[PDB]
Design a protein around this ligand. Structure first.
Ligand SMILES: *P(=O)(O)OCC(C)(C)[C@@H](O)C(=O)NCCC(=O)NCCS
Lengths: 48, 48
Protein backbone atom coordinates (compact mmCIF):
# COMPACT_ATOMS: atom_id res chain seq x y z
CA UNK A 1 0.00 0.00 0.00
CA UNK A 2 3.09 2.30 0.59
CA UNK A 3 4.28 1.89 -3.11
CA UNK A 4 0.66 2.39 -4.38
CA UNK A 5 0.03 5.56 -2.20
CA UNK A 6 3.55 7.07 -2.93
CA UNK A 7 3.01 6.58 -6.74
CA UNK A 8 -0.62 7.99 -6.79
CA UNK A 9 0.32 11.15 -4.72
CA UNK A 10 3.62 11.60 -6.74
CA UNK A 11 1.83 11.23 -10.16
CA UNK A 12 -0.90 13.78 -9.08
CA UNK A 13 1.65 16.51 -8.03
CA UNK A 14 3.60 15.57 -11.28
CA UNK A 15 6.89 14.84 -9.35
CA UNK A 16 9.26 11.79 -9.12
CA UNK A 17 9.06 9.45 -6.04
CA UNK A 18 12.28 11.03 -4.50
CA UNK A 19 10.68 14.58 -4.63
CA UNK A 20 7.74 13.49 -2.31
CA UNK A 21 9.03 12.33 1.15
CA UNK A 22 6.62 9.85 2.89
CA UNK A 23 7.18 11.66 6.31
CA UNK A 24 5.14 14.73 5.02
CA UNK A 25 1.28 15.04 4.96
CA UNK A 26 -1.07 15.59 1.91
CA UNK A 27 -2.03 19.11 3.26
CA UNK A 28 1.76 19.93 3.58
CA UNK A 29 2.82 18.64 0.06
CA UNK A 30 -0.20 20.44 -1.62
CA UNK A 31 0.82 23.89 -0.19
CA UNK A 32 -2.42 25.93 0.07
CA UNK A 33 -3.93 24.31 -3.13
CA UNK A 34 -7.03 22.75 -1.54
CA UNK A 35 -8.36 22.04 -5.06
CA UNK A 36 -5.49 19.36 -5.36
CA UNK A 37 -6.03 18.05 -1.75
CA UNK A 38 -9.73 17.23 -2.69
CA UNK A 39 -8.48 15.35 -5.85
CA UNK A 40 -5.86 13.23 -3.87
CA UNK A 41 -8.51 12.34 -1.15
CA UNK A 42 -11.06 11.46 -3.93
CA UNK A 43 -8.33 9.30 -5.67
CA UNK A 44 -7.39 7.51 -2.34
CA UNK A 45 -11.14 6.81 -1.66
CA UNK A 46 -11.59 5.47 -5.26
CA UNK A 47 -8.42 3.30 -4.84
CA UNK A 48 -8.56 1.63 -1.35
CA UNK B 1 -25.20 54.42 -1.28
CA UNK B 2 -21.92 52.42 -1.55
CA UNK B 3 -20.10 50.05 -3.94
CA UNK B 4 -16.66 48.53 -3.16
CA UNK B 5 -14.29 45.68 -4.22
CA UNK B 6 -11.54 43.97 -2.18
CA UNK B 7 -8.77 41.38 -2.68
CA UNK B 8 -7.90 39.24 0.40
CA UNK B 9 -4.23 38.31 1.11
CA UNK B 10 -1.28 35.98 0.27
CA UNK B 11 -2.77 32.59 -0.66
CA UNK B 12 -2.46 29.54 -2.96
CA UNK B 13 -6.20 28.76 -3.67
CA UNK B 14 -7.60 31.12 -6.37
CA UNK B 15 -11.23 29.97 -5.81
CA UNK B 16 -11.21 30.24 -1.95
CA UNK B 17 -13.47 33.11 -0.73
CA UNK B 18 -11.93 35.57 1.82
CA UNK B 19 -12.61 38.56 4.10
CA UNK B 20 -11.00 41.56 2.32
CA UNK B 21 -14.47 43.16 1.93
CA UNK B 22 -14.59 43.34 5.81
CA UNK B 23 -12.58 46.55 5.13
CA UNK B 24 -15.83 48.39 4.12
CA UNK B 25 -16.58 48.50 7.91
CA UNK B 26 -13.06 49.69 8.89
CA UNK B 27 -13.03 52.45 11.51
CA UNK B 28 -10.76 53.64 14.33
CA UNK B 29 -11.95 53.23 17.97
CA UNK B 30 -8.78 54.33 19.90
CA UNK B 31 -10.41 57.71 20.77
CA UNK B 32 -14.22 57.54 20.90
CA UNK B 33 -15.22 58.83 24.39
CA UNK B 34 -17.17 61.89 23.04
CA UNK B 35 -19.49 62.00 19.96
CA UNK B 36 -18.05 63.52 16.72
CA UNK B 37 -19.66 66.67 15.23
CA UNK B 38 -18.86 65.30 11.69
CA UNK B 39 -21.42 62.46 12.27
CA UNK B 40 -24.11 65.01 13.40
CA UNK B 41 -26.12 66.21 10.34
CA UNK B 42 -27.25 69.44 12.15
CA UNK B 43 -23.53 70.45 12.47
CA UNK B 44 -22.72 69.55 8.83
CA UNK B 45 -25.81 71.61 7.74
CA UNK B 46 -24.87 74.66 9.93
CA UNK B 47 -21.38 74.55 8.30
CA UNK B 48 -22.94 74.49 4.78
P1 LIG C 1 -10.07 25.12 -1.00
O1 LIG C 1 -10.10 25.01 0.51
O2 LIG C 1 -10.12 26.53 -1.51
O3 LIG C 1 -11.32 24.39 -1.72
C1 LIG C 1 -11.61 24.45 -3.13
C2 LIG C 1 -13.12 24.63 -3.40
C3 LIG C 1 -13.34 24.79 -4.91
C4 LIG C 1 -13.88 23.37 -2.97
C5 LIG C 1 -13.58 25.88 -2.55
O4 LIG C 1 -12.63 26.97 -2.61
C6 LIG C 1 -14.95 26.45 -2.88
O5 LIG C 1 -15.94 26.03 -2.30
N1 LIG C 1 -14.98 27.43 -3.79
C7 LIG C 1 -16.19 28.09 -4.23
C8 LIG C 1 -16.55 29.17 -3.20
C9 LIG C 1 -17.71 30.00 -3.70
O6 LIG C 1 -18.80 29.45 -3.91
N2 LIG C 1 -17.48 31.28 -4.01
C10 LIG C 1 -18.47 32.07 -4.75
C11 LIG C 1 -18.55 31.85 -6.28
S1 LIG C 1 -18.52 30.09 -6.74
Amino acid sequence: ASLLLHVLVAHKLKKSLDSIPMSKTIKDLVGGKSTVQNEILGDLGKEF
Amino acid sequence: AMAATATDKIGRSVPAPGKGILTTAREHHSSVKYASPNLNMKYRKRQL
